[PDB]
Structure formats: C-alpha cells, structure tokens
Symmetry: D2
Subunit: 517 residues, 4 copies
C-alpha cells in the first residue's frame, strides 16, 4: 500500500506491527523546519539552497552578534527569498524569528583573549571572585561571573555548571566577596561561557535593558515572532507584550521553557502566550537530564489539547556539525518528536556553525515525511475530539466538520480562505492527514502560518475584482493551480473548500466538497 | 459517559425528554379504525403510515380505505407549516394456508382434546363440513413435504398436531395441544419447505391494483430467496418503479439467507407473528437483533411488527412486558414500530398509538450516542460520493455545537437518507416538492418531512433560500428551536438531483 | 457453539450482526427462576414437576392466606425437594422465600394509589416471626421507602434469624429517589414492575429497571425483575412476542433472577411457563458481550485490598484464557462464591458446601450452581479439602459440564475456617 | 503522588501525556536490562566491580577483534569481579556473558596512514591476491572475491561506516566514481546494500569461535548478519549437544533479514535491532520504522528485544549525554524494549561508568511513565486462547496483582519459563524469580521486569518446608532491597510437584 495499511488497525500494538518500510510517503511535509542562521549559512548563495531543501523559518540568536550583523543577514534572508517571487504559484514564504538572550549569566575574558582556553584539572581548586579587576584576567585559579547576587542564591554545598554543564563546581568556602569552589569534573575552560545555578532563585529581570534594544530593533525590521528565553511566569510574557506595544501588536510571542519555575507554572504561561518552545538545552541542566523526556511530551500534549503551537528545540542532529550523517539516536529523536505531536522542529548549531548545513536540513525533511505517515490517525482524531469542549463558534463547527469530511472521502487537501490565519489554526488543531492550503492576501499571515502543523501557505498577488463572489472564487482556483503544480493532487480528485458569507475576519461558515478541475 | 454501565447507572426518571419522536409508527387500518372521523384523531395522536392487509378483502373494499385515509390527511391541511404527511402501505397476502368451514358456518366451533385423533384431507368434498374428526386445508401438495414425524400448527400456533400416518389425501394425526377449533384458521408448517410461490396470481392482481392507487410501499409477505424479491419487482414494472419494497422475514429459510435478500430490497420487516411459529419461540430475540444490526450497518429501514401492545386490544393500559418491548425495540435501533390487531379490531385504537408514542420518545432520549456514532463510522467504508462526505461531516458538526436540527433540501430524499444513516441526535428536517417522497420519509428515522406549496421562482439562488426559510418557520412554530440557535443547512451547487455538497452553519433568524 | 463467534467481535454493532439462531447454547443456565406457589401449584406431585423444569426458589405471597395453609405448602415443597435426596450427585437444593404483605390498604379487592403506614405492623411482625419458625431463607420486604424501613425490619428478626437475607422491593416513587441509601442497607433489590408501573408513568418503567440492575451490578448484589413477564400464559399455552423479548432483555440487562407471580399461582399452564423461562434465559446468556462487560466491571471496580477479592478477579481472568468448564469454589457462607460471580464469568461457578442454608441461598446470585456434600468430615484437613474437590468434579461430569481431560479452576485456602480463600489452581478434570 | 500514579489512572493516551509529572519520583526498581561491551576502558577487575554497582547486567564480548587468549582473560576477569559479592546471597546479583560473532564482514586492506578523496574522482577496486599492504588513493583492495558477480554497473558500495560511498561506473576489473568524498584509512568496513553475498553466516573462523564459547560456558550468542531461518538453524547445529540451552539472538542488520523477520523470529530465542549496520543498508530515515515494528512483534510473541548501537554515543568523549541521546533510550523502553545496550561507550570510551549510570536513571523514570491500562489490555486481546495451565496462571497472577497493587510477584522456576510467561504480560510489580540454576539466574536478565535471585541452600527433604524456604528467601531479599514492608500483600506462584512445567497454583500471601 502506501502508509495506509498501518492506520487501519483496532489496537495500538497491531499498528506498530504493520509499519512497513517498503511503503513510501505521498503527501507533503506537515512539520515546519526552523534553522538557525550563522556564519556557515549567511551568504545568499547558501540561503537560497536552504529554501530549496525545506527551510520555513530563519532564526537569529541575539545572544551574540551586533545589530549591524543581524540587519545584514535579515536583508540577505529576504533577498534570497524574493529570488523566487516571480511565479506566485511556486513561491514559498519564509519567516524571520528573533531569539532573546534573556537573564543569561556568562564568564569573563580568559587572560584577556577571546580565543584562550585554560585547563581545569580533575579535582583542582577554583576561586569565583565577584570583583571586577579580573574580568579580563581569567586564569586557572580565579573565575569572574557577571551575576552580582551570586552570593544571595547559593550556599556552602551547592552545584555550579559552566559551558553547557560539562564542568561542575561545588562550593566549600563561601564568603560575601567570592566563593571557593572545587572542580568535581573538569576539563577545558573557555572565555564567555554560560553558568547555570540549578536550585536557586535567580532574581534577574528576565526583561533587562539589553532586551529592550533588540525587541525595538526587531520591530523596526518587521520580524514575525519572538522567542522569549527563560519565561518563569505569566508576568514575564505580559512584560514582553507591553514592550512590543502598538507597533508590534501583530507579532507572535513564543515562551521558552528552560527552568523548573516555568515547568511548574506551564498552565499559567500557556494561557498568556501564542506558542511554546521546548528549549531542551538549558532545561536539561536546571532539572535532571533523565526527566527531560517527561517534560517534553507533557508540553506537546497540553498545547495540542489547546490548539497552540510548540517547537522542539536544540541538539537534534548535533553530530552533523562535523559529519555528513547523524547517529542512530539522532535519527530517532526527530521521528519521535513528530509522533508526540510537535508543530515544528529546529536546528541550532547544525546550520549556524557546522560544516554541513544543507544535509542537516535535508535529513530533517526526510525523517519528518516518514514520521508523519506512520501516525495513528484513528486514535488521535478521536481523543482530541472527545477532550474538545462544546463550542458556540460557527467556525469551529465548520473546522471539525471539514476534517471529518477529509477522512471520509480521502481528500487531497483542504482549501481555506483566511486573512488573519485564525480560520486556518482551527482546522490544523484537529490534525487532518490531508494538507491545508491556506490562501491569503496578508504577507505576514503567510509567513506566520508556518507555526501550525499541516498548513501550506500560498500568497496571492492578484488584484481584487468588483464582484465579491468572483473575488472569492478567484482565490480558490489559485489554490487548485498551486496544488496541481506542486503534486498534491491531480484533476478529477476531490478537495474541500472553506469560505464565508461576508468579507472580513471571523465568518468562515460554509464547507463545500468540490471536485478538482 | 465513557462506559456503558455508568450510562445505565445515570438514567434519571425525573428528567423528561425534549426534541420530538424520531421513530415512525405504522398502524393497520381495520373495522375499528376505518372512518374518516377516527382517522383524523389517529394522525393527531402519532400515526405516520397506514397499512392495508390484503390477506382478506376485495379491491372495492380497500379502495374506500385509501379514499378515506387521504381524506383525513389533506383534511385540515390548509396550513403547510403544521401539515404532517401520511404514507400508504399495502401488505401482500402471500402463500397462506387456510382451513375449511366448521359444520357450515364460520361461526361454529368444536373442542379438540389432547391425545385424541384427527384426519386431514385435500378432497374438496369436506370443504364446508369440517368437524372434530376430519379437517380440510387448501394446500393440495400437503403430502409431498411432511414426513411421518411432522408437526402441524393451527390458529396462531396454539393447536399442535403430530402427523402419525400419511398417504395421498389423508394424513392421520394425534392432537398434541387441544382447544376450540374454528373455521378458516391459519396453518404453519415448520421444517418442511413450501411449494407455493411467493408471488401468486392472486397477488399479481393485488400488486397491479396498488400501482393504480399511487401507493408508496408494499409489504411482501413470506420471502425465502432473492428471486422472490425479483418476481415482485418485475410485475411492478416501470410505471411503479419508484415504490419501495419492504421484505418480510417470517420463515427459517428467509432468515438463513438474510444477507441475500438485504441486497435485493429497499427495506426489511421483522414479522414476528409467523416467525415465532416457524422457529423456536425462545430464538426470536436473536433473529430480531441480528436483522436490525445488519440493516443499520447498511442504511436500510427495519420495522418491528406484531404483538407490541397485544394486551391493548381489550384493556386501555399495556402490561410491563409490552412496555419493555417497545422501548427495547428503539434501543435496538428499529426505524419504525408497528401495530396490527391493536388498531385494526381492538377496543382502544388511539389509546395504543398514544402509548407507543410515549415510550418511543422516552427511549430515544436514552440512546448511547457516543459509541453508536463512533461504531457506525468505523464500519462504514470510504466512498467517493461527495454527498456521503457532506453528510458524515454535517452530523459531526451537529454534535459539536448541540445544533437544533439539520435542514436538508432533497428531491428524491436520497440526500436525507444518507444523513440519517449516521443517526445524529438532532432532528433532520427535509424540504421537498415531491409528495411521494414526503410520505416515504417516515421509513427512515429522524427525518421529519415538510412539503412546500409555493411555486418555483425565476432566480434559482432565490428558490433555495425560500425553502430554507420555510423549514425554520415549521421548526420555530413546532418548537424545535428558538431565535438564535445554531443549526446545520445542507444544499448543492446546481439545480437538479445528486449535487448536494454545500454545508452552512447558520443561526436561526 | 455458545455464540462465541459473536463473543469475539471488535465493535458492539458487529456483535449483534453475528447472532446466529442456529448456534445452540451450553447446558448450564445462570439466571435464577422464582415461582410463586398457589392453588395451581400446591400439590406435591406437580411441585416435583416444577423441579427438573427449572424452579429454584418458591415464593410464598403473604398478602392473603393463613399460617396453617402456608406451613402446609412449605411442608410439601420440602417433601418434593427431598424426593431426589436419594442421590447426592443429581440433587438440587430449593429455597423458600416470604413476600410480606406490607402497607397494601385494600377494600376487599386490592387497588389503591406519603402513606404514613409503618414499615412493619403487627400482622407483619407475626408473619415475619412466623418465617423464623418455618426456617425461611430470605424475605421479600414489600414497599420500602428509605433505609429507615430496612433497618426497622432487620430489628424484628433478631438473632435466631440473622443469616436470612432481606430483599427490598422498590414499588413507589420514594424508593426510586432514595435508592442508594436502600441499596447499601439491604442484601439485594427486587424490581417489582407491577406495583411500580401504576405509580411512575408506564412509559418510564424501563429506565428505572435498567438503572437499578446496573447499580446493583456495580456494587455486587442480587437483582430480580418480577411481575407479568409471561402474563398471557395464565390462560394460553403460548407467550406473546413481546413477552419473549421481555425475559430475554431482562437477562441481557443483567438480572440475577427472574420471577413468576400469577403465572404459577393461579393459572391453567404452570409447568409450561417454568420451561419457557428456562429456554429463553439459556439463550440470552449465550448472547452476552463478555468482552465488554468484564472489562467495564473491572474498570469501575475499586482496589479492594481483600486477598479473596483479588483472587476472584484473577480466577475469572484465568477462565477466559483457557475456555474452562467451571470454576470450583469451597465456601462456608457463600461469600467466596458471591465474589467470583461479581465479575460475571462465562463458565458456571460450582459452589461446594456443607451448610445447607448457604446452598439454598446461592440461587440469588447469577452463575452459581450449589451442591451439598453429605460425606463425613475427615481427620486430615488436607484429605477433607481434596475430597470436596473430587466430589465437585463428579457432579460436573454427571450433569454434563465437562469431561475427563478438560481444565477447571479450583479455589481453596490455607487454613480451616472462614474468610481465608486465597489459593487458585488450574487442574485437569480426571 | 509517586511512581507516576496520576498518569496511570487516565482514560486517554492524550490526557495520560498531560498528567506526566517530574515531581513524581520513581519508587520501583529498574525493570530494563543493561548490556555493556567490555574493552580496554573496562577490562580490569577493579573497574569491572564498579560497573556492577552501577547496574551492569550483561557483559558482551565482541569477536570481530581480539584473540582467543585475549577474550579468555576477559571472561576470567568478569567472573572474578562478580563473585566479589557472593559472601551474602541476600544481595548477590547474577551476570550473564554474551557472545557476538564476527560473521560475514568485508574489510579493506592496509595502505602505503590516510588518503583524502575528491568529490568525483576514480578509484579502481582490485581483487588481486596481492594482499595489498600498499593501497594508495586510486587502487583499493577488499577480501570479498564475489563483488564482481554480486553487483552491476550502477551499484553502490559504502566504505568506513557509510561515510564514503562510490558508484559502480563501468565494470570488468571494478572502476568506480567517488559519490561522497572522505578520508580512507587502513582496513575499514564495507557494506554492499544489494544482492545476496555467498559468504557463510557460520564461517570457518566462527565455527572455532562458537565452539570456544561452548567450551567456556557462555550464556547467549549474538548471531551477526542473519537473513534466513537456515542461518539460525545452522548456528544452533554448530553449538550441538553440549550447548543445548544457550539462547540464540539473531541480529537484524540488512534488508533480507527484515523482509523475512517472521521466519527468523519463529526460529530464534530472541532478537536484536542492530541499528548500526542496518542504518547503512537501508535509508537512515527509515530505521525508526524497523525499530518499532520489530519490538512490537516480539512483545506479541513473548520474546526479548535489544536496542543496540549508538544510544549514548557522545559519552565517549564527554561526561554528559546529548538531549537527543537521552530521548532515544527513554523511547526505546517506552516502545517495549527488554534491554538497552552500549557499544563503544563502555569498550573504549573515557567515561564508561557514567554511561552505565545514565542508562540506569533514565529507564527507571521511563518505566514509571508507561501506560499500563492500555498496554496490559492489548497484550491479552491479541494473545490467543491457549490451554497451557502455566499460561493461565501468569495472566491471572498479573490481573490479581493489579487489583491489590502488590509489591512484587514471587515466582519459583527451575528452567525460567514460569517467570518468562509472567513477564510477557508486563506487570508493573517486579518479578522476583527464585532458582538454584546459575545459568537460569543469569539468562533471566533478558526478559523485562525479572529480578533473578540464586538460592544456594541445599535441597530439603519434605516438599513443603523446601518450597516455603525459597519463598522466604525472596521475602527477605524484598525487605532488604526495599521493595515492601512486613505486612504488605504479594503474589506467590508455585507448582504441585518437583520438576519443570507444573506452574499452576497462585497465592496471595502477606509479607511476614
Ligand atoms: O480567518 P479570518 O480572519 O476570520 O477570516 C476569514 C474571512 O475571510 C473572508 O473571506 C473575508 O473575505 P475577504 O478576505 O476576501 O474580505 C470571509 O471568508 C471570512 O470571514
Ligand atoms: O434529490 P437529492 O439527491 O436528494 O438532491 C437534492 C437536490 O436539491 C437541490 O438543492 C436542487 O433542487 P431543486 O432543483 O428543486 O431546486 C440540489 O442541490 C440537489 O441536487
Ligand atoms: O466462603 P467462606 O465462608 O469464606 O469459606 C472459605 C473457607 O473455606 C475453606 O476452603 C475451607 O473451609 P473448611 O475448613 O470449613 O472446610 C477455607 O480455605 C476458607 O477459609
Ligand atoms: O519454571 P519451570 O522450570 O517450568 O518449573 C517450575 C517448577 O519448579 C518448582 O519450584 C518445584 O520444582 P523444584 O524441585 O525445582 O523446586 C515449582 O514451583 C514449579 O512447578
């Protein structure tokens, strides 16, 4: 068959026994792919080849680089995207996302050099002086950190992790100026590395003065979304929404869960956020590493029940930084993220600094296409419906009804006509197997649609005819030509179209089953 | 609500039902229910279909019933907003076997005793002279089928007979269950296979009579093969090719070949009268649930027929068993429930129709819809018909917003049939200009028919909204929804038939 | 072919479509049969005919009748019961029950529609205390309204009659609302559709039946659906089509026993009605969705930390896996057998016992076939336990339940006494 | 709550995922076996003693390298380090010894030492029996004299873990075009993902290799490169009479062994999804499909599955695993794996102890988050109605243990099958198996949820005080290991006469 022999079972155990590797995919990719842009992927020549490989969102990590650096790669990103803006049938939009530095704590300058590297010995002594004079004179005896209140959160007998938590220190003697530490498992040290204090209440603002600069800078560059790092409560997401103000009212706020406080208040944060990012990098240091998988599936399942997007984040094909092929564990982590119900998957250092930025985006596209097919659609569509509440919205009743018609006639796609994208988000939350072709006039809506799994946005640049009925039916024939060209369906097939009864947002209420012309 | 057991533990008797009765009621017209005066009170009490039993009656007598029923339907039918169609059904005679007259007058009776002896004879001399010693039946070849271990039953299976000897004419018998033997009583022969055809020459004239009277359906009695379903369809011809055929299973062969007859018919009637005598009586409940379940899987109507409220022939209140029978027939999934002797000759006709309406809408309000709609979709295939996908997608939205009803514009009713296949909780309003299809709509559960009276407008798009606004007038008046309730409307893209696609969620104006 | 083709369907809808009338049932009937003894069944020779036809417990209505006649019917019921006592293998205990008159308020011929009447008057206390002297096994306390009434009855029968189980008959609107407080206070509930169909509207006497049967099924207590189920059989030798489906659906809904009132007391066809009920209930038992009832009975079941409660659930699970012939249980008070029946197995539960009152009382529960062992007690407790096991095997082979070679499940214990059932073993029939 | 009980009482797979809590600490013991390969980083006795304290259950010897004398000292040091704890049998942990055959592998020759290759140059493969000790960046040499008759113009050969792969442009000698480009070293592995190689699964070198394990009393065999059931037949025939009870594990590493899996599973005692060589013979984006399919079919058949290579690969150079490597082993035991493995992480790594402990903590947390309410239901629905009395006891023992929430299920067994039949229905409670057979105690590490304990006391006379002796032996081991307290209810399974195959009676006894 073609994936369809597995999804036709009465038990979850038999569904696994029917997973055939001789069954190829057929539909398009439903999981968006976010790649981090860096010095290995900044030229317009490579940025164009990434779009032809599967990239949908360009991420800029503002933990490094100056504004002139990020303004250049933004201009380079947009340049390589309009490289295909000629034919509007094959043109694929991509989005630009800003990543916050947040309440980060770093170390000083190792002997006044940005490339120096001291060597901690297994079991040596280390002093952590809160003074200033050694911020450019860091040797294998004294360490300088920029956290002023490091003494007002730690005590004698605490753990301290530096640079991705690879080296660890224990506090023996703790004064008020410094704190004597012993290397519990050391190695190579470096300059400006991140330090983690698991088990302490760090009182950093989580919306500092540097965050105001890059947020205001991001509004001026017209970015589509923001990844606020280290969100600990709903108060912080509210602080982000106020800083963006009226100029940035239409950009999406995605909260990065990275510490124990944010996990304990996930329901608090989700209700105030537009999306969630499972940032497993920092999260794996503040909590035990063996518990990360429990927190991941917990957040994917909760936001799936609310219809809000979540991303899987760092270290998915990390070995591909120095190798053209990933490892067996990495080939399964991406597959098991789509199966959990993730909306997008992300690449960080794999596309920013690695030696094979293209083959990493190619590998993610291959695995996600296979994982989307072997999804138990009988159990998923029933559970999400049974847990969904009774609604008075006509759009939601049309949305859930269109997905039932989608599974009934085994349709090729679901054409939805929206302007803000809200009518398209309500269809994707019920996860139809058929792709959702959301035709829009709003270029921002076309870029922001990459966050809700199943949506394939197309942007129509035609003028508007006088007869509204002719303008409505004009957007549908565009989606028929786009789907027929890209290989989604052929003439004679059956698709589902979603329209409304009046112009303006919030009126999608008619569903028609139309044959493909 | 997740379990079947807790659903039963949560049944409340102080929570009255709402909506309306979705299960249809078929009543048999007889000497006690024949006047145009009483027939007007049967429609007001819950009647939907009129059945004429052609087992005894000439064509002149039945033409008066049809002329009387239609007089009562279109009687106070000046308001189409409150007009309820009433269908007409013809029950075939079939290969019946009757006895002879007792001592010269159907009125006399003899007293048979257990362990005594009786003789059966086909010699037509004894015809109007059957006594307690010699019995006559109109089955000529009643000897080439029954062996020396046969078992004959007379008068609703109440008098048993054991065929001791046999021969050519005669057959010696020993009475097993005695009683009062009358004249012209029915005879049932279990085990043996009858040689009389299911479509006799007397039935051929009975069927051509129905084509000329504009009858909506026929109830063919005693069907064993699908060839029997083909003989009736042939004589109905192209002039009556639109009437629906409802096959009756009353024998062991018809049940053993039910799958064959289901594909060669439009509907099914579980005629439990003769069926309870042909097979063991304790096995009838197995056969009823098997047929209703198989037809629900296919979308064809079923009817539960005889002795539902049998006590109501003499008494004005039914027994506890008859109450738990009508309700358990709706919980089984029957499309309609019937009355026979309760309305044809009993002393309480409208009183039994009221009771069968009280219990039916009480059972619909307790149906476990959560796992019924789920199981129906899981066993129905993926079709290419765009109407099937529009139908299954419309009633799924009917559950999401707790819709008031589902308005469907149908010409031949085939659209509304596909909607009712999945059994939503909301009522299905069907608007049509075809009176035959508005009468034939009670065969399917949940479809409330409404016939339109206004002429066709010039603009077709204006013709659709004229009928959509009519169904909400019949609904707001009857009490199906109020001002501001979300409902489901179903239409198509072009005039004609077979183009239903469009589904619109709209509030009541 | 006990309708096992339908007992393996994936959906409940498909389970109906597999019901084959040509699939004969097993030889064991689980639903109890209760007959009301009257002028048409007071003989000692027809009462022997009502045995071997299906009667399990004889109901004696006390709304009219004197103690001299009631004790005479009790005298001949026991006479026709010990008729077969000249065979410990084929013998079958028969119980006796007392339906108290209660607050009837007649004016010469029944009829009538708070009543302010007591739960038990002087005529009730005398009739109730009369059952203690006559060794009745169970009482049908009529017209209960609250737990106040069930307690006011258990007090008048004090110490000599404590093991006698009371059965609350729901008959009015009060008990329909205060059902839960009357359930936990009683030992079993009877659904009297006759006296209840007049009070509540007729069109609703089926939601109350199904609701009461399921709640008692959940809690694990007996339920009985009683009056007019074969009413036409009083004057006619055949039942109607509606009556045959009434008894069938009653067994399907989950009733423990079915009752007959006027059909056996005053009527022309008494022995015939006792056989139609046996024929029907044997067929409705084969057409049961065991795959859904057992999983739902356990899903709502608690986490009772009783060692005997856990071995019961495990024994019913071990019987479905091997298609066993029966579940053998050694019990002294029936409680060990009442817990294996709570989870509704398919095989019969043969309960061996020496207590004769527990054998007669085992008819209140579904699927329990009690047999009484008359052999003397052995000096070695081990040889005495394995003796009652072999006695149960020969009984099953005689009544045609299994053959030398089939598998059975035996429940025994670690210590002589009561409340120590914790040993389950799978052994082949020798 | 604790032990993730909140997620267990759910009614949907979705809501069960939202109720997962990280403040719900695991309470039960670890129910997943651990296999670590021994090498220069873990060969010494003192380092071997620490690996047991960390949770090592099976020591695997890899026979693609090393001599017979080299492996003989490895088996000696393993056995020496484990009876270091045999003083008190109330805390002794058994340990199995696994055999991994070299099998049919093709490897290149020496060079000149590495030589880079271009993105589109030419390399002529030479099968000349020159025994190339000099292979420059043009002319390579293999030891497979059949690649000419097993490939055609347009084929593909992978070199060095599938890092460098060429295409078969022309033929007749073996000219090829570099379709990848890398650094080719001396004596590297080669993979031919196509036609059938005529190399024997049991080659002359492996015949003396399997006989060596029979003479050394190994406990299991990891047959490398199994494609047909005749291979599992031929391997069992080579073990012969002396090694009758050695469990054969067939490694699925190519496309033939996957298309004939039902044939190989029915003829083997177990399976291992060797994701290493398999990710080269098949597309890397499809190995996850084969992983979940092969696990689900053994759970349906009651046989063990091992997930093998590259589970914690980064722990070779760093002391902490990547967040993608922590999710791999958690989903592995969530898919139904019986044991997890480590290859180069314990043989030549720099942090071997930290790898064993990391695999221990993850599996313990992941076993607590298993949806048993659906797992136990589907396991019975697909298991057929057998009339094996020992099968009905096990299904009844697990059903009873869920009703009373037993702390353990004590099972006595002489061969192991009694405990294996209980484990196949996946009880949440740990299965305490008691036996006097050391081999049966060591092999029981292959079945998920079995805690083997060896009884060294002599056999008593009366068959009554001797059964209650071994039941109390599990009672004290449970109280010592902190499984339950004096007063809790347990499930004890026993027979009716000495000997195997009489597991029939189940008892619910209180802990004294
Ligand atoms: O998704 P939203 O923002 O509610 O918008 C959907 C709306 O789009 C509309 O097509 C409005 O039409 P225009 O965009 O062409 O004005 C209506 O179909 C519907 O109300
Ligand atoms: O007869 P069917 O198959 O039920 O279809 C009903 C038809 O009614 C329509 O609404 C048009 O009917 P009219 O021609 O009477 O206006 C179509 O959309 C549809 O094809
Ligand atoms: O049903 P009950 O009253 O709990 O009986 C259970 C008892 O029966 C036994 O099997 C044996 O009872 P006896 O010693 O009285 O013969 C015990 O194991 C157990 O305690
Ligand atoms: O597990 P196996 O090998 O099938 O046999 C287990 C048997 O061993 C027993 O422990 C008794 O045999 P032993 O003589 O070895 O103690 C019983 O519990 C059981 O019948």
């Amino acid at each position: 068959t073609q994936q369809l022999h597995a999804a036709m079972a009465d038990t979850f155990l038999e569904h696994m026994c029917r997973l055939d590797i001789d069954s190829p995919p057929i539909t398009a990719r439903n999981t968006g792919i976010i790649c981090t842009i860096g010095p290995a992927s900044r030229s317009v020549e490579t940025l164009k080849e990434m779009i032809k490989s599967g990239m949908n969102v360009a991420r800029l990590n503002f933990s490094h680089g100056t504004h002139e650096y990020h303004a250049e790669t933004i201009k380079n990103v947009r340049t390589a995207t309009e490289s295909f803006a000629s034919d509007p049938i094959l043109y694929r939009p991509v989005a630009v996302a800003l990543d916050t530095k947040g309440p980060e704590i770093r170390t000083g300058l190792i002997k006044g050099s940005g490339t120096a590297e001291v060597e901690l010995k297994k079991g040596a002594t280390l002093k952590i002086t809160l003074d200033n004079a050694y911020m450019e004179k860091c040797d294998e005896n004294i360490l300088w950190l920029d956290y002023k209140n490091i003494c007002k959160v730690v005590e004698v007998g605490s753990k301290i992790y530096v640079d991705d938590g690879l080296i660890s220190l224990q506090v023996k003697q703790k004064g008020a100026d410094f704190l004597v530490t012993e290397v519990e498992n050391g190695g190579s040290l470096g300059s400006k590395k991140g330090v983690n204090l698991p088990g302490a209440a760090v009182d950093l603002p989580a919306v500092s003065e540097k965050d105001i600069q890059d947020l205001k800078f991001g509004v001026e560059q017209d970015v589509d979304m923001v990844f606020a790092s280290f969100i600990r409560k709903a108060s912080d997401v509210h602080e982000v929404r106020k800083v963006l103000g009226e100029k940035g009212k239409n950009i999406k706020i995605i909260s990065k869960i990275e510490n124990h406080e944010g996990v304990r208040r996930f329901d608090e944060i989700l209700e105030a956020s537009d999306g969630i990012m499972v940032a497993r990098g920092d999260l794996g240091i503040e909590i035990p590493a063996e518990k990360v998988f429990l927190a991941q599936k917990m957040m994917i399942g909760r936001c799936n029940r609310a219809g809000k997007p979540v991303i899987c984040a760092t270290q998915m094909l990390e070995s591909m930084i120095k190798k053209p092929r990933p490892t067996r564990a990495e080939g399964s982590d991406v597959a098991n993220a789509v199966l959990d119900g993730a909306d997008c998957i992300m690449l960080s250092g794999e596309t920013a600094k690695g030696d094979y930025p293209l083959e990493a985006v190619r590998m993610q596209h291959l695995i996600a296409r296979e994982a989307e097919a072997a999804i138990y659609h009988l159990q998923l569509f029933e559970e999400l419906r049974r847990l969904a509440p009774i609604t008075s919205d006509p759009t939601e009743a049309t949305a859930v009804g269109a997905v039932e018609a989608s599974f009934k006639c085994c349709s090729g796609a679901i054409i939805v006509l929206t302007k803000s994208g809200r009518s398209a988000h309500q269809v994707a939350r019920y996860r139809p197997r058929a792709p959702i072709i959301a035709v829009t006039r709003n270029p921002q809506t076309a870029r922001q649609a990459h966050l809700y799994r199943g949506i394939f946005p197309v942007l129509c640049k035609d003028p508007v005819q006088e007869a509204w009925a002719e303008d409505v039916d004009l957007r549908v024939n565009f989606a028929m030509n786009v789907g027929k060209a890209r290989g989604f369906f052929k003439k004679g097939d059956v698709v589902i179209v979603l329209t409304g009864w009046r112009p303006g947002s919030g009126f999608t209420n008619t569903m028609r089953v139309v044959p493909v012309p």
